[PDB]
Amino acid sequence: MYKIQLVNQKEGIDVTIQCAGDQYILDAAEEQGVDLPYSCRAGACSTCAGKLVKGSVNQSDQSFLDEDQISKGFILTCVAYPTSDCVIQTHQEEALY
Ligand code: FES
């Protein structure tokens, strides 16, 4: 099982969840009592944006983030599958601009 540390601080947040390789980060968080932001749940907006600061994901369904944003670690948590243990900063839409 992958271990996913979810951090913000503002928003209050520092909690670790587990996530299977076939489960999206957002869904796993919700199953374990963590309320993360979302709207479309379809990879077509930035509501659920996070930043991957350690580890790897496959978020290839994402259709909203550009190459610079991807290079900076931004992810859409509603369509991200972990491929390793990860540290993800939550509520990162506000950090895009
Ligand atoms: S909630 Fe719209 S991309 Fe995740």
Describe the protein in words.
By secondary structure, this protein is α+β, with helices and mostly antiparallel strands. It has a single domain (1-97), classed as Beta-grasp domain (Ubiquitin-like (UB roll)), CATH 3.10.20.30. Helices cover 12% and strands 30% of the residues. It has two helices and seven strands, in the order ββαββαβββ. The chain has helices at 25-31, 67-71; strands at 2-7, 14-19, 49-54, 57-58, 74-76, 81-82, 86-89. The strands form two sheets. Strands 2-1-7-3-5 form a five-stranded mixed sheet. A two-stranded antiparallel sheet has the order 4-6. The longest helix is centred in the first third of the chain and has 7 residues, at 25-31. The radius of gyration is 12 Å and the shape is globular. The structure holds FE2/S2 (inorganic) cluster. It is classed as electron transport.
Widest sheet: strand ordering: 2-1-7-3-5
Return the string of H and E elements. EEHEEHEEE
The total strand number stands at 7
Summed up, the domain count is 1
Give a quick account of the main beta sheet: strands, pairing sense, barrel closure. 5 strands, mixed
Shape annotation = globular
Task: Tell me the span between the first and last alpha carbons.
Answer: 34 Å
Radius of gyration over C-alpha positions, nearest whole angstrom = 12 Å
CATH superfamily: Beta-grasp domain
Q: What's the CATH first level? A: Alpha Beta
Percent range for helical residues?
Answer: 10-25%
PDB class: electron transport
Keywords: 2Fe-2S cluster, electron transfer, FNR, electron transport
Assembly: monomeric
Entry title: Crystal structure analysis of Cyanidioschyzon melorae ferredoxin D58N mutant
